[PDB]
Enzyme design. Sequence first.
Site, mmCIF file in Angstrom:
data_model
loop_
_atom_site.group_PDB
_atom_site.id
_atom_site.type_symbol
_atom_site.label_atom_id
_atom_site.label_comp_id
_atom_site.label_asym_id
_atom_site.label_seq_id
_atom_site.Cartn_x
_atom_site.Cartn_y
_atom_site.Cartn_z
ATOM 1 N N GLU A 151 0.597 -1.378 -0.196
ATOM 2 C CA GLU A 151 0.385 -0.263 0.008
ATOM 3 C C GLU A 151 0.645 0.830 0.036
ATOM 4 O O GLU A 151 1.201 2.509 0.631
ATOM 5 C CB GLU A 151 -1.363 -0.096 1.766
ATOM 6 C CG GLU A 151 -1.944 -1.555 1.268
ATOM 7 C CD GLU A 151 -2.732 -0.993 1.958
ATOM 8 O OE1 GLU A 151 -2.746 -0.370 2.863
ATOM 9 O OE2 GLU A 151 -3.394 -2.314 1.730
ATOM 10 N N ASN B 212 2.077 -5.880 -2.649
ATOM 11 C CA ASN B 212 0.672 -5.748 -2.689
ATOM 12 C C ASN B 212 0.083 -4.187 -2.938
ATOM 13 O O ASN B 212 0.833 -3.336 -1.992
ATOM 14 C CB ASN B 212 0.388 -6.398 -1.617
ATOM 15 C CG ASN B 212 -0.471 -7.207 -1.734
ATOM 16 O OD1 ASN B 212 -1.336 -8.002 -2.200
ATOM 17 N ND2 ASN B 212 -1.688 -7.282 -0.058
ATOM 18 N N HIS C 96 -10.466 -5.751 -3.753
ATOM 19 C CA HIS C 96 -11.293 -4.921 -3.033
ATOM 20 C C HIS C 96 -12.745 -4.469 -3.918
ATOM 21 O O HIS C 96 -12.088 -3.108 -3.377
ATOM 22 C CB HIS C 96 -11.023 -4.755 -1.362
ATOM 23 C CG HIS C 96 -9.422 -5.094 -1.019
ATOM 24 N ND1 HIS C 96 -10.880 -6.042 0.157
ATOM 25 C CD2 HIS C 96 -8.714 -5.197 -0.753
ATOM 26 C CE1 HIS C 96 -9.583 -6.730 0.534
ATOM 27 N NE2 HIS C 96 -8.235 -5.872 0.524
ATOM 28 N N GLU D 286 -6.638 -10.544 -1.602
ATOM 29 C CA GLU D 286 -7.360 -10.642 -0.588
ATOM 30 C C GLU D 286 -8.555 -10.031 -1.026
ATOM 31 O O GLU D 286 -9.508 -8.982 -1.189
ATOM 32 C CB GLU D 286 -7.099 -8.678 -0.010
ATOM 33 C CG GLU D 286 -5.248 -8.839 0.024
ATOM 34 C CD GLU D 286 -5.282 -7.802 1.311
ATOM 35 O OE1 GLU D 286 -5.612 -6.734 0.958
ATOM 36 O OE2 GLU D 286 -3.963 -7.449 2.144
ATOM 37 N N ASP E 266 -12.121 -9.541 -2.432
ATOM 38 C CA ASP E 266 -13.202 -9.838 -1.720
ATOM 39 C C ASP E 266 -14.283 -8.777 -2.589
ATOM 40 O O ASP E 266 -13.513 -7.725 -2.846
ATOM 41 C CB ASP E 266 -14.207 -8.926 0.033
ATOM 42 C CG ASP E 266 -13.072 -8.321 0.434
ATOM 43 O OD1 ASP E 266 -12.717 -6.738 -0.411
ATOM 44 O OD2 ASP E 266 -12.313 -8.289 0.775
HETATM 45 O O1 LIG Z 1 -9.498 -7.392 10.512
HETATM 46 C C1 LIG Z 1 -8.339 -6.682 9.346
HETATM 47 C C2 LIG Z 1 -7.908 -7.123 8.409
HETATM 48 O O2 LIG Z 1 -8.984 -7.595 7.420
HETATM 49 C C3 LIG Z 1 -7.513 -5.608 7.441
HETATM 50 O O3 LIG Z 1 -6.793 -6.496 6.457
HETATM 51 C C4 LIG Z 1 -6.044 -5.797 6.003
HETATM 52 C C5 LIG Z 1 -7.022 -5.301 4.651
HETATM 53 C C6 LIG Z 1 -6.995 -4.000 3.736
HETATM 54 N N1 LIG Z 1 -5.029 -4.603 2.830
HETATM 55 C C7 LIG Z 1 -4.058 -5.043 3.726
HETATM 56 C C8 LIG Z 1 -5.008 -6.384 4.871
HETATM 57 O O4 LIG Z 1 -4.016 -6.260 5.630
HETATM 58 O O5 LIG Z 1 -6.035 -5.266 8.359
HETATM 59 C C9 LIG Z 1 -7.110 -4.041 9.182
HETATM 60 C C10 LIG Z 1 -8.130 -5.079 9.983
HETATM 61 O O6 LIG Z 1 -8.425 -4.945 11.286
#
Ligand SMILES: O[C@@H]1[C@@H](O)[C@H](O[C@@H]2CCNC[C@H]2O)OC[C@H]1O
Length: 302
Positions: free
Chosen positions: A127, A169, A206, A235, A237
């Site tokens: 990020e 990432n 996302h 990731e 969703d």
């Molecule tokens: O539990 C939550 C995680 O799912 C969240 O994970 C992030 C989502 C966005 N991209 C990077 C990931 O690490 O991080 C916050 C936490 O509260």
Amino acid sequence: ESTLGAAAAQSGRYFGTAIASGRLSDSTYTSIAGREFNMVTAENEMKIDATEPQRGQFNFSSADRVYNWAVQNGKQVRGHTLAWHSQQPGWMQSLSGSALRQAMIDHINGVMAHYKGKIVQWDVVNEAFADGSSGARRDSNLQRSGNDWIEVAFRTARAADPSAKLCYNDYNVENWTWAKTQAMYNMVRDFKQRGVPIDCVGFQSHFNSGSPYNSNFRTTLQNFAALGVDVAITELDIQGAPASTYANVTNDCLAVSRCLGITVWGVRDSDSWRSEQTPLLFNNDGSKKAAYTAVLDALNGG
Ligand SMILES: O[C@@H]1[C@@H](O)[C@H](O[C@@H]2CCNC[C@H]2O)OC[C@H]1O
């Protein structure tokens, strides 16, 4: 095949999830995740604060619970994440400049040593780009330490564990036309020109109404692959879990030889960080949603 991971494996790919250590006492969670996935990412336990809660004092207890669960259940592990603006422990948040740079390096070295040879992909840097039109780097203590922070993280990681695939990432980098995507593309292109050791690019995926899926995701994946990196969906969703979009994303991965696999960011909707958006493949009671069937069918080729 009858499960996501096995179906993906028929084409040489994985199908993974994010695992939370505190949920490893939940029989529905562990049995569904055990059955369905062949790749695990720790949702939180391998982040900087979790693993190094005081400077120099590592704590792998929760991380190792996830890792050990994964390998006891026949899964590989993606390490997430070594250098990131978010979820830094307080002691790192207060550092700047050269002291921060040293702490970043030390953190990478210590975590990677613990897992040397055991983790197939690391999200070394996460990020680093700003959202919006600028394509600028995100403001953080790390970025303020110098533009080279990312390259230094990668060089550190390559020396610490030469066996690991090293990934960059990010999110909002799936749509080929977006400025953020192009910023990431040009960074990876620069790294390959200057010999910086990057093996893979992770597309968090996302998808939601403000950052919607576009068919040009396939173009993005192809174009990054052509720079000489692997690509992965890390990731996934999707707001509302529409079957159509889930199938599109799956087919985009299947169309790109260097797309390693797909990880969805959790198991049941209620496990999601964005549960209110019901964005995953299983219902709260563990049953399969329409999107599950669409993904499985895509992985099985119809
Ligand atoms: O539990 C939550 C995680 O799912 C969240 O994970 C992030 C989502 C966005 N991209 C990077 C990931 O690490 O991080 C916050 C936490 O509260």
